[PDB]
A paper describes a structure:
We find that as long as ice formation is prevented and care is taken to limit damaging dehydration effects, gas stream cooling yields lower mosaicity than more rapid cooling methods (plunge cooling and hyperquenching). To assess the impact of the cooling method at the individual protein level, structures were determined of normal plunge cooled and gas stream cooled tetragonal thermolysin.
For gas stream cooling, we employed a vial mounting procedure to transfer the crystal directly to the cold gas stream rather than moving through the low-humidity ambient air. For the nine crystal/cryoprotectant combinations tested here, gas stream cooling at 100 K using the vial mounting approach yielded lower mosaicity than normal plunge cooling into liquid nitro­gen at 77 K. For the subset of crystals tested, the anomalous signal from gas stream cooling was comparable to or stronger than that from plunge cooling. Gas stream cooling yielded a stronger anomalous signal and SAD structures could be determined more efficiently (i.e. with lower redundancy data) than with plunge cooling. Both structures have the same 33 residues built with alternative side chain conformations, whose occupancies are highly correlated, with the largest occupancy difference being 0.1. The second cluster (181, 182 and 183) forms a part of a turn at the end of a helix and includes an interaction with a bound cation. There is thus very little evidence in this particular case that faster cooling via plunging into liquid nitro­gen changes conformational ensembles present at LT compared with gas stream cooling.
Author numbering: 1 to 316
């Protein structure tokens, strides 16, 4: 919509106050003109028609319970945009400043959130398995990272390539969570999963086995469920990424940690320059080693740590 750029205030799903960029034309709309070709947040009104109505508010104050999923979808899309632009010099998910559109209140009791190829879609959850999923910055950034993947390597969503696709989204979802630096961790979805249970998550990057996911190539799932285990076998790569950043000794292999910024630079370069739609785990290792070589030199600690981490998870 055409209007004045304004700054509203509201509270997100977890009750935290934040400012949001809006546009004023009779109503205040969740339209942020400060980032690329805009960030736009819509109300699906418990239906499945997309995108729905551009979110309109009478007073630029978003403190109602019904407002909270929209506040977070809008604000965390902005954080994700800022991460990719400021850290990787990438303008929106496509690198060409595409508008970021999100719809909240999708369907009823819907325990999922997804990038659908052109926008983000957030269920409100059923209140037991999930609360509204835009409350999780890692979920928001995980799904927007699928769009980055689609516009770069094009990893296919099955078998090893699909597990890499998933892990890439968990890695950058977590790096966005740290970039905000409010309540970061190496878990996925902890803010919105199981409101009645503290200390759990959908999966752990630091210890995938906590939730029964593999932490070594020898433990990879080879069945047909979950598109060949894409959210399961992601644990193998997630563990490697955790080790690259934080270090540790895993199955007797010591890894010298190089920190989060270098992890992100290495994997971003791998994704955008070297991976292809059918890259397997071994090819990801090669891409990460080559990326670290490009950035830091073949004799660098960074290259050595990449190799150690993939060794530790059994990926040669
Ligand atoms: O679905 C509708 C959308 O197309 C637009 O017109 O904004 C209002 C919504 O009701
Ligand atoms: O144009 C392409 C679009 O159709 C989709 O495939 O996502 C990646 C883009 O390069
Ligand atoms: O395109 C944007 C317009 O929609 C808004 O009204 O003001 C800022 C512009 O950049
Ligand atoms: O506690 C939260 C509240 O602060 C917000 O306004 O609406 C959603 C709730 O989860
Ligand atoms: O979605 C609608 C939008 O298209 C229009 O510009 O302003 C009102 C909204 O309901
Ligand atoms: O609208 C109120 C808001 O002004 C305040 O900041 O937090 C409580 C809300 O109910
Ligand atoms: O063969 C693997 C071994 O090399 C490693 O140390 O731990 C897991 C085993 O499956
Ligand atoms: O069965 C597949 C297995 O062969 C591969 O190694 O990892 C992904 C699985 O889907
Ligand atoms: O992946 C690279 C590709 O993007 C470039 O266009 O040609 C050389 C390749 O290494
Ligand atoms: O061609 C190589 C590719 O297969 C690997 O995955 O990434 C690095 C490239 O050198
Ligand atoms: O070759 C390396 C280069 O690619 C990078 O600039 O880091 C230092 C050099 O060792
Ligand atoms: Ca209001
Ligand atoms: Ca997290
Ligand atoms: Ca929980
Ligand atoms: Zn998803
Ligand atoms: Zn995913
Ligand atoms: Zn967290
Ligand atoms: Zn799955
Ligand atoms: Zn998923
Ligand atoms: Zn271990
Ligand atoms: Zn460990």
């Amino acid at each position: 919509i055409t209007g004045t750029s304004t700054v509203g205030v509201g509270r997100g799903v977890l009750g935290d106050q934040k400012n949001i960029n809006t546009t004023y034309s009779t109503y205040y709309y969740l339209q942020d003109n400060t980032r690329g070709n805009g960030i736009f947040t819509y109300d699906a009104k418990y239906r499945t028609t997309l995108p729905g109505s551009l979110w309109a508010d009478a007073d630029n104050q978003f403190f109602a319970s019904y407002d909270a999923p929209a506040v977070d979808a809008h604000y965390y899309a902005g954080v994700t945009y800022d991460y990719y632009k400021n850290v990787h010099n990438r303008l929106s998910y496509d690198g060409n400043n595409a508008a970021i559109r999100s719809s909240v209140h999708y369907s009823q009791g819907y325990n999922n959130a997804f990038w659908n190829g052109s926008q983000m879609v957030y269920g409100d959850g059923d209140g037991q398995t999930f609360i509204p999923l835009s409350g999780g910055i890692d979920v928001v950034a995980h799904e927007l990272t699928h769009a980055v993947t689609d516009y770069t390597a094009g990893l296919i969503y099955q078998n090893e390539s699909g597990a890499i696709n998933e892990a890439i989204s968990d890695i950058f979802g977590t790096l966005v969570e740290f970039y905000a630096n409010k309540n970061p961790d190496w878990e996925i979805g902890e803010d919105v999963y199981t409101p009645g249970i503290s200390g759990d998550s959908l999966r752990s990057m630091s210890d995938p086995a906590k939730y029964g996911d593999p932490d070594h190539y020898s433990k990879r799932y080879t069945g047909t469920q979950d598109n060949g285990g894409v959210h399961i076998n992601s644990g193998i790569i997630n563990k490697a990424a955790y080790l690259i950043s934080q270090g540790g000794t895993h199955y007797g292999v010591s890894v010298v940690g190089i920190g989060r910024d270098k992890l992100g630079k290495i994997f971003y370069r791998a994704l955008t320059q070297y991976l292809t739609p059918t890259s397997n785990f071994s090819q990801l290792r090669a891409a990460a080693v080559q990326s670290a070589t490009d950035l830091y030199g073949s004799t660098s600690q960074e290259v050595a740590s990449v190799k150690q981490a993939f060794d530790a998870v059994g990926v040669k």
